[PDB]
Design a protein around this nucleic acid. Structure first.
Ligand SMILES: [Mn+2]
Lengths: 126, 127
DNA sequence: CCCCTAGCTTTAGCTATGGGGAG
DNA sequence: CCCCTAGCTTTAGCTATGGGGAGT
């Protein structure tokens, strides 16, 4: 459930989705395997909580908990950016067949239900 | 439902709650009236979408849509900070009875349900 | 709507409530 | 757990995945 940063009590979870360039179904086999590895590593390094993360031929789906003071875009930037660089060094076709691994676009959807009774305990905890 | 910033397709809504210092029930009458006014003004200025916002004696409750690239804490900072300064200039007791209007704490809860079928249209919209 | 730019990491490749520009 | 600091607006009063020092 909830977690607390310096004086900020939060529960922030997002549904993030992004596709490779031209929607090329390259996220398969060893590539999708490596992709998830690097993102988990990034998440640990950026204190991001990876909840759900399944990969599909032409897109990835991540559900993460991120400190509102940190920023979703910051996580996405390291995720997309590092993956592209690292992958393009291992899987050569990613570099030759595509100018970049990803696009400058992503899908962000906030997830969570109105947590009544947790609001009241917060208030009384003040 | 969804809005698009430069290449980012988003739907980010938060439930924000914060209380005045010492939980002093000062957010009533003309004070609560002015509080909501200023926040609405701030929201317009920061392109924040004020959905729900009711005030209570010892705490405010806001439900807003915020561009993920902008940041929730940025909106919160301007909201708490501006309100505190402006209010304490109008309602004198707020300055004399309290050292500051708010505390350095707030409650942030993400709200929204898994939008299947919007995910797919996004993907297919990627050409 | 697209190419450029500054900012920052991956020092390559992605973000910036981004910018300026058609005509 | 708290007081200080830099950053930024409100130029007062609030944030910073904040900091550093005392600390069951
Ligand atoms: Mn899917």
């Amino acid at each position: 459930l909830y977690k607390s940063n310096h004086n900020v009590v939060y529960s922030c979870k997002y549904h993030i989705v992004w596709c490779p360039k031209y929607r090329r179904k390259v996220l398969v086999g060893a590539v999708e395997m490596r992709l998830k590895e690097i993102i988990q590593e990034v998440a640990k390094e950026l204190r991001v909580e990876i909840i759900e993360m399944q990969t599909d031929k032409d897109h990835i789906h991540i559900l993460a908990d991120i400190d509102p003071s940190f920023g979703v875009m910051k996580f996405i930037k390291t995720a997309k950016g590092r993956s592209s660089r690292i992958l393009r060094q291992e899987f050569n076709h990613l570099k030759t067949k595509l100018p970049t691994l990803w696009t400058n676009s992503c899908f962000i959807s906030t997830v969570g239900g109105a947590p009544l009774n947790v609001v009241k305990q917060y208030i009384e905890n003040q």
